[PDB]
Design a binder for this molecule. Structure first.
Ligand SMILES: *C(=O)/C=C/c1ccc(O)cc1
Length: 125
């Protein structure tokens, strides 16, 4: 395992050192998005939660293509305000229900330490 707790205050500094292989050792799902919502990184734990194959969703748009259930003011709306503002740090519960059994999760969205990238972290509840 990589030992990093979900919700940790300095998580963006810790994850700045990991490559795709290290990200697969986290105890929670991790997605890195660009400012348009395209998927740059997608770890093994996220694929275990949602059924998606990580290598197949990299490059797709999360809000348009992969996760239309998140295209709502409650999820995408928060993301886009964060990108526009250049700051984002929010945690909320959500249900993922597209082409899968409805699954309740906790989501943490946080701006990355690098400029135009954003993390989405997911764990079951
Ligand atoms: C709603 O459409 C949610 C879909 C979804 C969430 C998270 C993922 O990693 C993949 C699909």
């Amino acid at each position: 395992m990589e030992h990093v707790a979900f919700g940790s205050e300095d998580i963006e500094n810790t994850l700045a050192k990991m490559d795709d292989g290290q990200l697969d050792g986290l105890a929670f799902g991790a997605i890195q998005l660009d400012g348009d919502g395209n998927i740059l990184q997608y770890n093994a734990a996220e694929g275990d939660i949602t059924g998606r194959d990580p290598k197949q969703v990299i490059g797709k748009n999360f809000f348009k293509d992969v996760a239309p259930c998140t295209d709502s003011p409650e999820f995408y709306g928060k993301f886009k305000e964060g990108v526009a503002s250049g700051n984002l740090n929010t945690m909320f519960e959500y249900t993922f229900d597209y082409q899968m059994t409805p699954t309740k999760v906790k989501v943490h969205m946080k701006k990355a330490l690098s400029g135009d990238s954003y993390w989405v972290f997911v764990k079951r509840v």
